[PDB]
């Protein structure tokens, strides 16, 4: 599955529910320590709807367990993210992913 | 992210210079074997948390 560790605590009461839209800031790097993506570089928060297979499984499962304003770290195994095919030219096959996620706003 | 660490250092070998360095730069306390630092979640030494 996915492992979640808390960096900065959040509200602790509000959680993402069905039909809502999450606005997050994230940064993703490989297990070796090499960065491959960051939404703060583009200076625009990422927005996605939960339950509509818009993103990979691990990102959604990690974001489902976080409260409003929380900042945490997520780890995803290869069978959850891109499997054995990877992302051509970006992610090699059989890679474990590490994300640093902050939840900003809901809907 | 903002950097902030606190700890102890040794006079003989701890010498950070602005700019480049080990890893991806930004060397502070705990990025060699001459300093020992803390930041709230990790113990840093030898450029390893």
């Amino acid at each position: 599955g996915v492992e979640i560790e808390t960096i900065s605590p959040g509200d602790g009461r509000t959680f993402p529910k069905k039909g809502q839209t999450c606005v997050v800031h994230y940064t993703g790097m490989l297990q070796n320590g090499k960065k491959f993506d960051s939404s703060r570089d583009r200076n625009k928060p990422f927005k996605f709807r939960i339950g509509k297979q818009e993103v990979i499984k691990g990102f959604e499962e990690g974001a489902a367990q976080m409260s409003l304003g929380q900042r945490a770290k997520l780890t995803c195994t290869p069978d959850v993210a891109y499997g054995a095919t990877g992302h051509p030219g970006v992610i090699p096959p059989n890679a474990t992913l590490i994300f640093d996620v902050e939840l900003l706003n809901l809907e | 992210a903002t950097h902030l660490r606190v700890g102890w250092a040794l006079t003989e070998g701890y010498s950070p210079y602005p700019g480049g360095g080990e890893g991806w730069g930004g060397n502070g306390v705990g990025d060699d074997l001459y300093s020992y630092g803390f930041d709230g979640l990790h113990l840093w030494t030898g450029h390893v948390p």
Binding site: K34, G86, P88, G89, V90, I91, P92 | -
Partner: protein
């Protein structure tokens, strides 16, 4: 009817006669001791000194020099025309096959000591220089002539597999670059293993920009972009940031 010919053609014919005789003698001498380990032999036709072939190769290298880039337009055009004519004559008489055969004969030995095991210590001091000069003369012969470069379309593996060799790597790389530049059609037969071999050469021999130029030359064919090549290069070079 009797027609007079220019002196340039007669000079070329005489040089061809002498060079063909000498290189046939050298090939026979090389084939003499194939597979018979001993301390004596005749690498040349009748155990001639090996300095003669070196001098002949250097003279041939000097013969095929391209014109200076600082000359006038018309003079440069005339010099290029003469060089093309001379290259066509030499190719037609059949020196390319002779050079290829010499390279094939010499390729079976991996080091100077291994060659001296069959030709003696007295003849092993010129092996590396002869190989380098042979690659240089091949590159000089095929440069700028697409008709000559078209001969390599069916023997690409024979050229690619020799990039591992560490005696004359630069000459092989230059020959491959010339072949790729002159004849874009060969871009349609490149496969994955050749690209991986080139990338492995880059990994093994250090950071060299000639390999980057060679890789760049494999993407566009006279105005159309050849995707596969681009996709394979991106997939095999980029993701592993090493």
């Amino acid at each position: 009817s009797l027609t007079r010919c220019q002196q340039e053609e007669s000079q070329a014919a005489r040089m061809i006669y002498s060079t063909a005789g000498l290189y046939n003698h050298f090939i026979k001498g090389l084939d003499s001791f194939s597979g018979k380990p001993r301390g004596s032999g005749a690498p040349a036709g009748t155990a001639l000194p090996l300095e003669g072939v070196i001098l002949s190769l250097q003279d041939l290298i000097g013969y095929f020099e391209p014109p200076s880039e600082e000359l006038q337009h018309e003079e440069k055009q005339s010099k290029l025309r003469s060089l093309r004519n001379r290259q066509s004559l030499f190719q037609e008489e059949g020196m390319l096959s002779l050079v290829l055969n010499c390279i094939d004969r010499l390729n079976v030995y991996t080091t100077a000591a291994h060659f001296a095991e069959f030709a003696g210590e007295e003849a092993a001091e010129s092996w590396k220089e002869i190989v380098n000069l042979l690659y240089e003369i091949l590159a000089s012969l095929i440069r700028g002539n697409r008709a000559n470069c078209a001969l390599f379309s069916n023997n690409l593996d024979w050229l690619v597999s020799k990039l591992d060799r560490l005696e004359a790597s630069s000459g092989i790389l230059e020959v491959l670059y010339c072949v790729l530049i002159e004849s874009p059609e060969v871009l349609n037969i490149i496969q994955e293993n050749h690209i991986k071999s080139i990338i492995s050469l880059l990994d093994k021999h250090g950071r060299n920009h000639k390999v980057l130029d060679v890789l760049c030359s494999l993407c566009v064919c006279n105005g159309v972009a050849v995707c596969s090549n681009q996709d394979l290069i991106t997939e095999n070079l980029l993701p592993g940031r090493e």
